[PDB]
Amino acid sequence: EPEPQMVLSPLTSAAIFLVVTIDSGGEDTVRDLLSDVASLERAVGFRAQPDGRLSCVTGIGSEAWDRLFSGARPAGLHPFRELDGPVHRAVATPGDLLFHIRASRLDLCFALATEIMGRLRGAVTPQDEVHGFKYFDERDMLGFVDGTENPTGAAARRAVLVGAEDPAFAGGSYAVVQKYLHDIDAWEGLSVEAQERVIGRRKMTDVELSDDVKPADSHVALTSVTGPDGSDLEILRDNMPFGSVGREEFGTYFIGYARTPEVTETMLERMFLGTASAPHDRILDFSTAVTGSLFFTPAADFLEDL
Amino acid sequence: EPEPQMVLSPLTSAAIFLVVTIDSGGEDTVRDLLSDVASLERAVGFRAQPDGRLSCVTGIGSEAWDRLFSGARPAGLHPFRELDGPVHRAVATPGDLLFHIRASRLDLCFALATEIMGRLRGAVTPQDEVHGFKYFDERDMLGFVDGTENPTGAAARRAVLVGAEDPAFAGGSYAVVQKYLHDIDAWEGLSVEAQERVIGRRKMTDVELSDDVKPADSHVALTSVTGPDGSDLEILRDNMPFGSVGREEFGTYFIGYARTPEVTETMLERMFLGTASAPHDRILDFSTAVTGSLFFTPAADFLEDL
Amino acid sequence: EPEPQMVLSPLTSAAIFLVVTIDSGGEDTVRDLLSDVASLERAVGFRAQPDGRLSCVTGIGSEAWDRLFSGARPAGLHPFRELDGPVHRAVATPGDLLFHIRASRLDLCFALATEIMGRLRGAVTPQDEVHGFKYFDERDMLGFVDGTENPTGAAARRAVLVGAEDPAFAGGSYAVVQKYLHDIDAWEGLSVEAQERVIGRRKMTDVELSDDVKPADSHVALTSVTGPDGSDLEILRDNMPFGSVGREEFGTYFIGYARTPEVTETMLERMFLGTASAPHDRILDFSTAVTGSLFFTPAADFLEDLS
Amino acid sequence: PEPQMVLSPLTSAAIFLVVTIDSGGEDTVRDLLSDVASLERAVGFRAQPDGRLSCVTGIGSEAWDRLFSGARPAGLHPFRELDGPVHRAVATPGDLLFHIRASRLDLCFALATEIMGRLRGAVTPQDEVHGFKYFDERDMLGFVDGTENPTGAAARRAVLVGAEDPAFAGGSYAVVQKYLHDIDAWEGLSVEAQERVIGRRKMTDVELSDDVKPADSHVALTSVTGPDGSDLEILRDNMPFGSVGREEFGTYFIGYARTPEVTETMLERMFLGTASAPHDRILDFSTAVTGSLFFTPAADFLEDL
Amino acid sequence: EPEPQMVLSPLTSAAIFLVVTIDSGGEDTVRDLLSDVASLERAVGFRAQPDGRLSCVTGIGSEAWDRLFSGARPAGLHPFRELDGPVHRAVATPGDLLFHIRASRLDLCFALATEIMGRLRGAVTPQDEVHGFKYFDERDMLGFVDGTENPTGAAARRAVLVGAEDPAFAGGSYAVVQKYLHDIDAWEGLSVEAQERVIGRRKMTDVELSDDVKPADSHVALTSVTGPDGSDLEILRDNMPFGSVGREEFGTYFIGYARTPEVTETMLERMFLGTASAPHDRILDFSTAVTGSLFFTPAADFLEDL
Amino acid sequence: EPEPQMVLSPLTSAAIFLVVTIDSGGEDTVRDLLSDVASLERAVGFRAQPDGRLSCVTGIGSEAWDRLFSGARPAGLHPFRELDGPVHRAVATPGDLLFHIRASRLDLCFALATEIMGRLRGAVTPQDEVHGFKYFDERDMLGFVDGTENPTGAAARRAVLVGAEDPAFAGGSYAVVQKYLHDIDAWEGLSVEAQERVIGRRKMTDVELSDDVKPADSHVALTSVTGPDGSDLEILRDNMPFGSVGREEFGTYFIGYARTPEVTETMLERMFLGTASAPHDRILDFSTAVTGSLFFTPAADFLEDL
């Protein structure tokens, strides 16, 4: 079988998100790193066995793919599609490589990132760097438990991993990243009950609102998508809080994995463009996307055979 | 193909056992809960990732099944069979629903139980509620390590999960519960060596007694059962100590999972009714069963498709 | 230099509260136990070094004291004073001995309680037994962080330990216990904002409400007491949640330590009888006291020097 | 007098927050200062036994005059800029210091949010650093950092203001400097060369013998004996920080002492050098980008506002 | 279908290595133990659930196999082959039974070893006993991170477990043990850079040296073996530091598992005898092997069916 | 005030006991180390803040003291007094320096011991080296909880630390070490009840036997000593289990601290020589002392001012 990257691994207490573009004539240096990335992961990771839980997921953008590789392309790989809604906008920003680094400790993440960037120095330009941290009982900056309804086990495997529909890239996945900044002043102006109506779940207990009470423009309502078969379309989210108190930055770093970008994009469209019953996702009234990129995260063996 | 409940999950340091009967005209409320139980489990459980280890196993009694569902019944589902032995008696007590809730912390168990009972309020009558706690190095109230010979891996899967013998209910299991109260005064009257002869294992080291020394009326001897094919008949036990010091209650809450109740019942019969070589299980001379109920724990997907 | 009991020790994740009365002619058996209690604590506790954090605080009631001991009495030792307010009542219930047992694990608590009761069997009658457990991020059954404003360090020592004002009992303390049951249905009927106005603190963040917004009948307002010298009167609280889901019991087991019972009683009076600005503590509209007892917890050396 | 948590040990997470007080912001600041310990408990109690949340509040020299009337701490003055032949220790603006520590970053961030929420519109942020533990108590140079910190009574005598200034007993002086390291240059050296810069073995953290230890090594220059012949000591709570993209690999230096003279003597030896050493060799790989001095008063001082 | 021993389990912080020879007429006692070994493992192990991580891997030597069993032999089972190189020698020493005991605590290891030896007393002669301990961030006595490049997941399973090539012993594995003593005085005489050239990896960061800088006589170079198929030949190593400061013993206890001993032996030959480009492994200039034994570790069910 | 060594620190899960004699003309090297010992402790210890709990207590023997220092001697410092009882003998063995190294991890202990011995190499001869480990719930090799009645707080300070009775050495303490080997075969021949009568406490629960049942020749009875004022004379014990399964070594490494050796010696005399009511300590019927040494552990500042 093909061996996937750690795209199915659970949420950790620390994360580093690193997005870079490949400079002119940097292809060679990048290809060398890509073949050594798993090697670097073990080099750092083994030091903190067995509680370290260091992993790195490497993603490659659409434009970057053509510059790096000859032959077949992943069927669903394309640039992030900008969504200009009536009120809210999902922007597309540059990104060739994604490094999604997770561990139970930030030091492990930072050490690995140092090794990666040390090898890439002079071949890449950094676009974005976010240091994520767990906030209390798995909460986001809005004060709600975040990640509850992530699929697990076989359900996760079927939702995330590329299969027979694109057999040359089986074991791969698609990652969509968006950096969100929150308007905390406005958010804290709402009552808890009002906030619950925005999300679609109880704040403290994380219990889902009943279908009779759950608004149609609530986050949970709009991101609940059924396919033609009537089965649920699911994504795996590894969102992390981040921020800077001085600059009044309180953020959610969104990352979602899916076997096809169509699933994530459908959810994006419902959020930004709305449905017949909802103008847009109410969460966006308190959340601004400042980045937006799409990457293909190939199977581990693909990177190694370079 | 069918996804079982957490019937194969290991012992935890905290547990809540909840047994209720369904009131007249409470069927509708119960069916609604049953479809939401896994949802409630995640809602509470996700807060304490990743060390929480919160799980809930839901069981349905024989009489309750007929009230709740139409169509096929699990082949082995029947009311708990009372055993009136010459000396000791295994009583049958009322119970329609079983909630076997486990976590590494009691708060998680209590929180989930609160949500379940909050939804069931006015539709059910509580019969029994036990808060179990780990006692030293996996000991019971008799001071012996308890659970040692539980099957693991494939052996556990084959012993616990319903398979091809009842294909419509594959992935299900049968749970037998008995609340035992111990006569500690009498037990502590025995020497350690005498106690070892009752159980069939060394007290401190938990090493099994050799076959030449192990009495025929010892607990280990009587609960060791070989089937017609010569293979060992096994059950998975999740026993928890409980008690109240003031009321002089020192208890073992027995729960055993098996793919067919015949296995558990055979062991029960040997214990209470005895064999040709043993009058009864010597453990019963220091243990009184005060409850007795049998439940079928269906596959997770069965509950969800309601 | 007198050695106090673990009355200054922090909150743990598990606790057992045990209240018993001494039967007729049980005095001798009780005195023997009291001299061995610290010994039993070590016997169980040492097994779980160093994360066990097993402790037992032993308290003796007013009536019980006279039955047990011959000489001087602690100056502030008296039976719990029942408070019959216009609406709410703080009941006084029987209790001769208090065992406040804490550890990081319930097994340690249960093991010690077993040894104590095994020695006391036939000499005492159990009045109350509560198994307390930590609830999330130090929350009570009302869903609020509970214990925030407990004094620490020197402030705790000055607030809790008997000193020169009663030198024969220096290193002792006074414990007031009340078992509260909560009306969760009524409580969950309120909005979070309304609940915050009852307590006097933000629910999720545990941040105290500003003085301009904090109601006069809020829990925090009424339990804030300044003495004649203008300094704050403080108590050390070791409250634990408890309950049974089936019987719809959601409880707070209140225990407060102070160097004099006057401090705790003042707070009690303000809660139940009210002030000029407040009828009563709004928390009592959702909380019923079902027990009430006062104990003196002597210095460790006092217990050891028996017989 | 009850001191702040200036004697508390190093934690795995820290937030350093330096702000200046805007014109007419004094009132808002004084209100916060009286509530800071209250806010610390509000957040800290949530994580009660593992959390180890603490906040040390420091006040600058210029800020002190704007905030308070009456006596000043004897040693309180603005950070003294040191213009050495080669290296420079810059002085940058800073009125308030918030040194926030915990075993988890969330606790630090939560407390910082509450503090800044109260100070919004009254202060301007100058610096914000999120510190993290790096392996076995290492700094960005790859050396164990904090080994020779005083403990127990020795720490108490070195850090806490006593009878020499009785009105401010239980207080302390904090010097902060944000350092950025030239990792490329540093990693160009052999381990042995690096050891000669620091004055200790890299892996084992064992101090070099006096026969081998260079006179311009970090350990040599920061070893100071007073007129009484006893060692002059400071308590350091240095934390690594950085951003991989911007090539920032930093040490956030913070040192507590009962008098700033001790820290300043060490600073002078580092930047200006001695007769035997031009300067501290560590500075050849380290650039100070901030420099501020604060007085951290006793806890009761803040509360009685 | 066959259940293997814990040969795939990760490194722990404590270990006991026990090598014994079977005395004349001790076969019967040994066979009885072998059938009870898993039983003894559970008896001790269950006490420290779930963080104990107690395991025991039992190995049987070539000569011992013939004395114990009739019928088929594992295809690759033979005595350890002594290697007399020009300079360095890999000695073969006596060993009939191997007990590889691991846990997160030494007490668990010692307790199990006590029970095993208690049963074997008078039937076996101890040859070697080593108490291993974790040294900082997974380091060996040479001060390098040790075990980094161990295979994981499916790769580990394919490298370690006997399969269809010997179907009667599927689920088994081959263990090679060597006790090494290090010349620390000589080693510490080298600069860090010189030490890095001996190993083939950076000392502190554990990052592998680039192929342009990595010497041909470095440890990593010589133990990197590609098969006829062009794929990498891998072994699973569970090396533990040990020693005594007074007697100047600073040791590495080498143990390597592989599906065939040919893999381990190839690496051994390259180390001791060298290649065309390298005289011998430079690590041996600072390391002396004092024991050398080869064992077959059968599937668990093989031991149980005795 | 004088700063003591970590003689009051609690028991840890790992320990190394190191006893050496000073070779001829080794005094200078030893004095240099003694001044650096605290420095070496911090160098290793700080790496594992804050759970490492690394400490080293350095002790100096009577004969060694005269060779190392001029001026005053500790009042109670003398060679270990051999006790030749009717049945059992407490031997005196050579020892000039004691290093009592403790931590929560063995690696820390081993690392520090390496540094100490590295500095002392060629100036000292090792006499004894023991690696101690925690055994279950603070048990010794006899299976009893060991250390229960150790004094704590002020009581410990008054029992252990030299005070005004010898003001020049205030903050110092006296350490007596004895390596005991146990006859486990004989011990396990006794019933639990018989073992309880030997010790004077219940085996499993660690509860002290009542005075009516406690034998006069029990360990607890003989080591209970009251001074002239009727208060108890106490010592602080840091006993650690050790052993080797192959060589049938199951040991207790006894170390006791006291402000004067008279206390420890009184207990020793009662144990070996007996009283009017007891021939000897029954524990000695199952325990053989193979070493015996007495050391003075000076205040920390004494070592530093060298």
Ligand code: HEM
């Ligand atoms: C009265 C309450 C009970 C207590 C305190 C108790 C305790 C124990 C103990 C100490 C052991 C040996 C260690 C172990 O393997 O777990 C054991 C084994 C066992 N018990 Fe029980 N038990 C009780 C009731 C039952 C009941 C009612 C059943 C059957 C329905 C049962 C089935 C077993 C089985 C199958 C074993 C494993 C025997 C073997 O294969 O070696 N137990 N029990």
Ligand code: HEM
């Ligand atoms: C450029 C950033 C700095 C780094 C990376 C750094 C690193 C270190 C290291 C690795 C040590 C040895 C281990 C230890 O005992 O902590 C040390 C010691 C020390 N450092 Fe620094 N340091 C820095 C700046 C400073 C500054 C600005 C001062 C104050 C003027 C200072 C004062 C000290 C002192 C007093 C010692 C202990 C010396 C002794 O008594 O042995 N350091 N530093």
Ligand code: HEM
């Ligand atoms: C003298 C004692 C030995 C020491 C101290 C030692 C140490 C090391 C170290 C530090 C590494 C690099 C990190 C790692 O991947 O584990 C390594 C790699 C390795 N060692 Fe050893 N080793 C020893 C003996 C052996 C022996 C006898 C074998 C085989 C029979 C062996 C096989 C390997 C293999 C296969 C690797 C991985 C190489 C790669 O694929 O990069 N080692 N060893």
Ligand code: HEM
């Ligand atoms: C032969 C090895 C020894 C073993 C296995 C051993 C074991 C024990 C045990 C199980 C206890 C009771 C629990 C406790 O309080 O710690 C105990 C108590 C004690 N032992 Fe030992 N012991 C040994 C040698 C010694 C020696 C040589 C001394 C004195 C020099 C000593 C002094 C004591 C003292 C003072 C107590 C406490 C007595 C009391 O007040 O209850 N032990 N020992």
